[PDB]
Amino acid sequence: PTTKPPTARKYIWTNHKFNVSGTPQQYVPYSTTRKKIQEWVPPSTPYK
Amino acid sequence: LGLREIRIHLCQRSPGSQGVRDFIEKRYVELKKANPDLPILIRECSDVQPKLWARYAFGQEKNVSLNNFSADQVTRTLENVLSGKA
Amino acid sequence: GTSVKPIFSRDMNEAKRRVRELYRAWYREVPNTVHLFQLDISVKQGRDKVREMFMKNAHVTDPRVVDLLVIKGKMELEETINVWKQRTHIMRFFHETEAPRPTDFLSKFYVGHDP
Amino acid sequence: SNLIEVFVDGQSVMVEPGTTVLQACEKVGMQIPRFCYHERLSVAGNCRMCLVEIEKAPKVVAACAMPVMKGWNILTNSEKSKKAREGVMEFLLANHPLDCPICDQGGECDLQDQSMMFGSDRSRFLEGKRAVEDKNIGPLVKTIMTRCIQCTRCIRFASEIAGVDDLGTTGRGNDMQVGTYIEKMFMSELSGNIIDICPVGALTSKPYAFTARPWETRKTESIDVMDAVGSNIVVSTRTGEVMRILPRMHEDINEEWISDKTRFAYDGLKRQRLTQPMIRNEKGLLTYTTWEDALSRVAGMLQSFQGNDVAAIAGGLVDAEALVALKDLLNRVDSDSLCTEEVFPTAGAGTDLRSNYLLNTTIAGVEEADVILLVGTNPRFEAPLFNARIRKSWLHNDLKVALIGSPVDLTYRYDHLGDSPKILQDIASGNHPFSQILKEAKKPMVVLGSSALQRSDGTAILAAVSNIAQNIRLSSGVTGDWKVMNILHRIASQVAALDLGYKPGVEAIRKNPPKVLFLLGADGGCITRQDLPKDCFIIYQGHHGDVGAPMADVILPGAAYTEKSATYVNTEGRAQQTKVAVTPPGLAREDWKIIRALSEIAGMTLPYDTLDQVRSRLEEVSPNLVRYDDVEGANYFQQANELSKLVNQQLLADPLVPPQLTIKDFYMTDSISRASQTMAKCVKAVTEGI
Amino acid sequence: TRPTIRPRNDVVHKQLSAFGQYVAEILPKYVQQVQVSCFNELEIFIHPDGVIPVLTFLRDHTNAQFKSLADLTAVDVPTRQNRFEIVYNLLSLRFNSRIRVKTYTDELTPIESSVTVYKAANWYEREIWDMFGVFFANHPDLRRILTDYGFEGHPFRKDFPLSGYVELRYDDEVKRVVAEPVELAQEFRKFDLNSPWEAFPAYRQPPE
Amino acid sequence: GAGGALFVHRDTPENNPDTPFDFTPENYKRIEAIVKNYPEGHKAAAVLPVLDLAQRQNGWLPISAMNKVAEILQVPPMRVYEVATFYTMYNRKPVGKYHIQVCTTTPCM
Amino acid sequence: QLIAVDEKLDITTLTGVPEEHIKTRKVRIFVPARNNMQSGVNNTKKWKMEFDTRERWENPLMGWSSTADPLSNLVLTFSTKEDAVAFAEKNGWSFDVEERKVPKPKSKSYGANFSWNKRTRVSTK
Amino acid sequence: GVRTSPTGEKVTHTGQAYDDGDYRRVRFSDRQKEVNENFAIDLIAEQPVSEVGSRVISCDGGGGALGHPRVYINLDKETKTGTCGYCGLQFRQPHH
């Protein structure tokens, strides 16, 4: 890389991270989609 | 204790319903004139059998076979259920 | 008519005879199974389970189906006797980690949508 | 007879005179490639993909337009036919954009599939491609015009099926384009169908954009409940979620089309959903609770009150299983106050004769009539596929149409006799020229919309229309099975309710104000708490939070039509059953199962435990509800006419006005459509130009 | 037609057709059909009762000499009244040829075990029994070979579900491996790939 | 080469549906004479001449002229739009008082 | 040797299917509808048997689609409706059959687009 | 274009953040939540619109065979810009 540097992009990490498994920086999977069914919200006022 | 509804199921083109058909052709009209508040339901039925249904208070039901009945037999059965008998 | 070829039995009498023979063999095997596999059940429980498995198929009226059922039961008996099976396989008949699923309408209605 | 013998690949077949080469090849089970031919549109012949070789003929013919000649030998797989298909695919793909990964048509593309099957595997085109600007024809149909192959299917459908002349072609040659030439919204109740018939991704669904691919979808064949036509549909799902609605071909009912509400209101199934049982707390607010607590409260209130005190109102989207279950449950407490929100006259024959409240002629029949009279109804919005059938007859059979009501636009020319109900009497007496017109008609048809019946003088209106039908019958005799009398419904649950003995209308509720009220999906706002005594116990069962939910004491979350196997009866009286596409959300349950569990808690357990048992009970009450495609019925018009002649209720000097006066009203009509954001966009688009 | 199309061999096609005619003439009692595929493979469709004679002839005849059983398997076609199709593949070293013998059976009808004709069949017939449930009469030792001990049903059958009916996990309360009804975190996603346009005109079926 | 003219219409303050256009009474007499030539029930056949007549009075064809022809002949406006964009002698933009057209085809070239 | 068995065919006790998935299941026997997005008819030639849709829920991790129905993916292909019915009957499944729906023969005529007095005449082409 | 929810959790480009009463947030306690910080919608919104002197332009994403399939964009509408359906780049003709 000293004689053939890689192409520069502004989204490439400027700081390499090692394998962070077994560490508070580890990856935790989760669903990236939003809620599908919305429930009806009852009115806040009494009905009688 | 009392009549709530009547259901008559007759096959459209089976011989065993023929007499019942005659009833509806002739004697249903005046029977509805006499009973303006009684729901009588005429419905088509499967190749099985013609039938009459009577409903009473609190959902009590029992049925009567009308297979091969003539029109007079049909109206006799209908007046028997319509009266305080059987 | 109906033009079928038998497996072993020509009518239900011979099939019943084979069923009785297989039942005798399982009945004799149960105490040895309890000893060898070091099972925590009684011999009474094992024989009751054998009877229950036999009665699961009491409604069969086809001699060929009965012949195949006896063949499968003999396969299972041979498997048990030779210790090809392990304790987990024997205990799979008793469903000891399965929570009882209800059968009445109201409980089914409460838990979910399946009938 | 008149059949002629022709050969497809050396194999003999007999065809009717005037049959096209394409249909003859179809007789032996061979499908000719096509892009512009649609068997329900007028023949165009423009795409040129259907070119085939006839033996001993130097020129290939267009199979979709050319009539077979006696003794001809089609050759569908000769070298000439294959080279024709390859050349036509090459010309079609020359200017097509490299859009497949971003095109919604991706796995469902006729162009892609016919390229794979009949075209070459390579390009020798070395020029630049043409690109055209996009058109905006509304919020429902997304337009990407570069993809257009100029089939002209959209133009023929809009002109002939929909009745609108907004689409066309501007320019000529390579630059010819399909559009409106001006900023115009192609807005109509059948508009979405141009997405189905367009073979490419030029016309796509805007609500459906980018969400799914066809190979991952699961197909559930089901029925629509957005109106009383009962159109066959396919619900496409993926991983437990409803993706979209598609038409399913049914020749008798909806052909291959569906209305825009049937197609685009499904997203409302994801909004305002009742998911858990709710009860009123100490402060009078609705709060979540368990099924057991809610059922116990309802059962306690049910045990205390009996007979007249207990009442039920059924809504527009209720199924026959739930209806019969509720009928049995209220009968066990000696109650007969089981009503619907939609009024049908109970005078004379009433519900006793099925013929009285059904469209006897049927949807298929319209094709056999020559004169139709429509009274107090807008066919276009109350039953768009019925109006489509009427326009098909008007176009192909020269059907004459007359209307009594407000001069609504039906998309085809009709005779406006006026809007005064007294005109009906004038037709019945014989002083109107239309009386003579009906007198000489071989297959006269009279259709009365249920919407007209809602008004107070409806019993009178039905009597007058029955009088018109009787005059026709006595003057011309009965030709056989024609059934002049017809009733056009607009509510999916109405016909089954009437078949079950339910009393039409909410009048008995007002006559005998109940203490315990069962709102079974009833969101019409007909009965409020001003029409009921105080301390009235209102139980709402349904799937949406609408008019009927926030006024209830106990809320029971039910399943929508996409989440159960349920029976619906259309205007014709035909009975159809839906299938489970997805399960009900949260804690919601099947409606008849709710009623059966409630019956068990209250001690009067209903005899049925499964769906087959509840359908056996359904057969016990009304046997026609378990015949799932049969529409045959017996005519009892004479008896009903006799029974109608008894009372002589007076008409009103009030012009007949349809509820759906204009297109904007068509969209949001029921609780599912009122919760749909797509319908809100449609309403905003038809009210605001932009 | 030259570079990308597989070349033909008419000499082998003729030889296989003649030998199929030979076999059919010699054993009319059992041979129901003879076919030569386009890529020169000879198949003989027989009656089940002739499994043992036919194979024996094909192994011992001087002009046959198919002394090697390359494979034996079953195919499940639920639409047929006889569900299962039994396929024997034989190789002749003396004549450097291959032959296929096909027969049929259903769920309740045994097939004669051919261990006597070929020793290799033993495990093949055990495998067919295990995967498809086809019983073989007079088999020396017929039992499951591939499936787990006590496994119920036959996996290769079309009706059987891909993931089966039970799974296994270790349970600490009973301190052993247990079998329970299958639950899946992610359901297998069924794809509908079949194109609505016909691909091969040569195989078109009559329109009934 | 390429045509250059666009085949969509975008409203402008000088060309919109409310741009004033109406036939002169003499042009209405001519329209009646033009309409009479065709068989009854086939009045549309007059789209081609009457449209031209509009252009002969105004100079070009604003969108209001197309709307007026469509309303006079009771033809859907999109049909008149199709006719106007198909034929090259129709001027959908203003032109000069004198329209010079030079032929450049092969015999003329 | 033949033994002349007299009873209806029944193989449930040999298939190894748990009884829950034999008694509470409903199969549908049908010819699938043509996909309305396309004109090809090649997917409307054979009969299909498929089971009733059961519950699908959301995985707490990753939000995938979870099922507990082992027959949620099983689709069987048959030549004729009789074969499908026989298979379902011998396997002990309750079934619902739907008659095959074919498109009706339509009378097409290109010349009708230019009718002298008919309504069929095209306003555009 | 990152931004935190009222609970202090980062909101992803997708826009999903666990609700206040959602127990699933417990999966992040004593650990972290993976969020990519380079929002593509914002990065593509910074690119300048390319001005070209033709009605139809071509885009392949740059790099030739290393980009996307080549597409042609019409630039006749002057009220908007032509946007690539693959890369998101914008094109217009010299206007005003």
Ligand code: SF4
């Ligand atoms: S319409 Fe078909 S061929 Fe054209 S881009 Fe879309 S998928 Fe590809």
Ligand code: SF4
């Ligand atoms: S948009 Fe679709 S239907 Fe209309 S002309 Fe183009 S390809 Fe044909």
Ligand code: FES
């Ligand atoms: S299908 Fe015949 S020309 Fe298009």
Ligand code: FES
């Ligand atoms: S007038 Fe110029 S080429 Fe004909």
Ligand SMILES: [Mg+2]
């Ligand atoms: Mg399309």
Ligand SMILES: [Zn+2]
């Ligand atoms: Zn790009």
